[PDB]
Amino acid sequence: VNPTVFFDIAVDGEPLGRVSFELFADKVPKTAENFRALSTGEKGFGYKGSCFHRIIPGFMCQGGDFTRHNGTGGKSIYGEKFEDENFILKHTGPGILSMANAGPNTNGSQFFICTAKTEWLDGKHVVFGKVKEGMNIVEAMERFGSRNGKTSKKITIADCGQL
Numbered sequence: 325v326n327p328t329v330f331f332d333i334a335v336d337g338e339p340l341g342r343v344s345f346e347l348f349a350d351k352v353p354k355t356a357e358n359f360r361a362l363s364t365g366e367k368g369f370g371y372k373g374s375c376f377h378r379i380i381p382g383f384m385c386q387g388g389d390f391t392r393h394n395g396t397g398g399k400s401i402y403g404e405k406f407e408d409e410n411f412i413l414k415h416t417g418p419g420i421l422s423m424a425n426a427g428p429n430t431n432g433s434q435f436f437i438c439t440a441k442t443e444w445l446d447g448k449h450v451v452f453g454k455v456k457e458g459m460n461i462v463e464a465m466e467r468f469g470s471r472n473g474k475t476s477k478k479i480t481i482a483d484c485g486q487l
């Protein structure tokens with residue numbers, strides 16, 4: 325039942341590999357649906373062509389700002405922002421897929437993929453999925469990050485959709 329979505333990642337326009345995610349629609353259906361629909365593009369906007377604007381190795385990779393490409397933009401399928409659905413799931417380790425935000429009830433389209441356990445984010449960012457296949461590609465993406473998060477090459481979602 326839980327949907328699977330994929331990202332095809334490129335590095336300076338060169339294909340790197342595919343990352344796939346299980347979205348926990350059974351526990352966070354509204355949040356999972358937003359990510360699913362942004363991944364297919366079915367509403368007329370979404371993640372295809374967008375970049376990962378911040379990659380901190382040993383922490384996380386952040387993306388999903390498809391309108392300003394720098395962390396200041398993005399929007400949900402429900403409007404500019406939507407509420408924190410619940411905090412049932414925790415940031416348990418690498419691979420966790422979770423919503424980025426600017427405060428309570430400000431979810432849009434930005435998200436992050438954990439590359440470490442980030443337990444201090446529990447109860448503040450809505451976890452809604454996990455990497456299924458392609459964690460090795462996330463690890464490869466991490467090598468283009470830096471301590472301050474600026475990437476050393478452009479890391480893009482060249483294609484995305486639902487499997």
Ligand SMILES: CC(C)[C@@H]1NC(=O)C/C=C/c2cc3cc(ccc3cn2)[C@@H](C)OC(=O)[C@@H]2CCCN(N2)C(=O)[C@H](C)NC1=O
Nearest residue numbers: 378380384386395396397423424425426427434435436473
């Ligand atoms: C509108 C944006 C969705 C929203 N924007 C703002 O809240 C305004 C803040 C911008 C900002 C936050 C920065 C945070 C870090 C490093 C550099 C930053 C540079 N700029 C480290 C400590 O933390 C992260 O990387 C964390 C990891 C978890 C994901 N995650 N980032 C967020 O959900 C941040 C908190 N929220 C935004 O990105």
